[PDB]
Design a protein around this motif. Structure first.
Motif, PDB file in Angstrom:
ATOM      1  N   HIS A  56       0.801  -1.212   0.076  1.00  0.00           N
ATOM      2  CA  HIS A  56      -0.159  -0.031   0.057  1.00  0.00           C
ATOM      3  C   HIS A  56       0.660   1.287  -0.187  1.00  0.00           C
ATOM      4  O   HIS A  56       2.050   1.379   0.505  1.00  0.00           O
ATOM      5  CB  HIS A  56      -0.943  -0.136   1.146  1.00  0.00           C
ATOM      6  CG  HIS A  56      -2.049   1.246   1.069  1.00  0.00           C
ATOM      7  ND1 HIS A  56      -1.642   2.408   1.212  1.00  0.00           N
ATOM      8  CD2 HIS A  56      -3.351   1.373   0.745  1.00  0.00           C
ATOM      9  CE1 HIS A  56      -2.785   3.037   1.242  1.00  0.00           C
ATOM     10  NE2 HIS A  56      -3.634   2.413   0.504  1.00  0.00           N
ATOM     11  N   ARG A  57       0.376   2.094  -0.769  1.00  0.00           N
ATOM     12  CA  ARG A  57       1.219   3.601  -0.982  1.00  0.00           C
ATOM     13  C   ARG A  57       1.774   4.092   0.382  1.00  0.00           C
ATOM     14  O   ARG A  57       2.753   4.582   0.594  1.00  0.00           O
ATOM     15  CB  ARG A  57       0.406   4.400  -1.645  1.00  0.00           C
ATOM     16  CG  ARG A  57       1.340   5.638  -2.010  1.00  0.00           C
ATOM     17  CD  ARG A  57       0.432   6.640  -2.477  1.00  0.00           C
ATOM     18  NE  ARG A  57       1.394   7.788  -3.097  1.00  0.00           N
ATOM     19  CZ  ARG A  57       0.830   8.635  -4.092  1.00  0.00           C
ATOM     20  NH1 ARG A  57      -0.480   8.742  -4.248  1.00  0.00           N
ATOM     21  NH2 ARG A  57       1.562   9.387  -4.715  1.00  0.00           N
ATOM     22  N   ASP A  58       0.877   3.767   1.343  1.00  0.00           N
ATOM     23  CA  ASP A  58       1.327   4.373   2.823  1.00  0.00           C
ATOM     24  C   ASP A  58       2.356   3.714   3.182  1.00  0.00           C
ATOM     25  O   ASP A  58       3.231   4.227   4.086  1.00  0.00           O
ATOM     26  CB  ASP A  58       0.007   4.029   3.603  1.00  0.00           C
ATOM     27  CG  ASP A  58      -0.587   5.466   3.836  1.00  0.00           C
ATOM     28  OD1 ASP A  58      -0.206   6.270   3.386  1.00  0.00           O
ATOM     29  OD2 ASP A  58      -1.868   5.434   4.369  1.00  0.00           O
ATOM     30  N   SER A  74       2.564   0.602  -6.111  1.00  0.00           N
ATOM     31  CA  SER A  74       2.110   1.114  -4.912  1.00  0.00           C
ATOM     32  C   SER A  74       0.464   1.044  -5.389  1.00  0.00           C
ATOM     33  O   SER A  74       0.021   1.152  -6.545  1.00  0.00           O
ATOM     34  CB  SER A  74       2.111   2.500  -4.728  1.00  0.00           C
ATOM     35  OG  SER A  74       1.413   3.196  -5.684  1.00  0.00           O
ATOM     36  N   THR A  76      -3.866   1.846  -4.047  1.00  0.00           N
ATOM     37  CA  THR A  76      -4.305   2.896  -3.291  1.00  0.00           C
ATOM     38  C   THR A  76      -5.614   2.231  -2.613  1.00  0.00           C
ATOM     39  O   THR A  76      -5.773   2.802  -1.452  1.00  0.00           O
ATOM     40  CB  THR A  76      -5.055   3.893  -4.438  1.00  0.00           C
ATOM     41  OG1 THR A  76      -5.628   2.868  -5.430  1.00  0.00           O
ATOM     42  CG2 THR A  76      -4.042   4.779  -5.211  1.00  0.00           C
TER      43      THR A  76
END
Length: 97
Positions: A56-58, A74, A76
């Protein structure tokens, strides 16, 4: 040096990672790419030999850091089927090519 390893990582690697892995895995198997292997594990645990890392991008920043030399993709959303579909088509394209 052939890209055949895809691994999904997360904070605990016991939640979203499970679903991401299953869907990607199924698509890969469907495409007749038995040569490609799919597994999931915590971010703290990523073998340096991994070719593709999906998170996950985070948390993509973290994975990049462990191996910024690796390929990172990544996401979203957990059920972002559109992204998953696009990524799959791409990997298939990269497999032939």
């Amino acid at each position: 040096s052939h890209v055949r390893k895809i691994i999904v990582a997360s904070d605990a690697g016991m939640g979203s990672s499970a679903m991401g892995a299953g869907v990607l895995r199924k698509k890969i198997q469907d495409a007749g790419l038995s040569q490609i292997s799919v597994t999931n594990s915590a971010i703290n645990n990523l073998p340096p030999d991994v070719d593709l890392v999906i998170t996950h991008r985070d948390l993509t920043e973290r994975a990049m850091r462990q191996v910024p030399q690796a390929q990172h993709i990544s996401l979203t959303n957990f059920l972002d089927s559109g992204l998953y579909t696009s990524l799959t088509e791409r990997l298939v394209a990269a497999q032939r090519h």
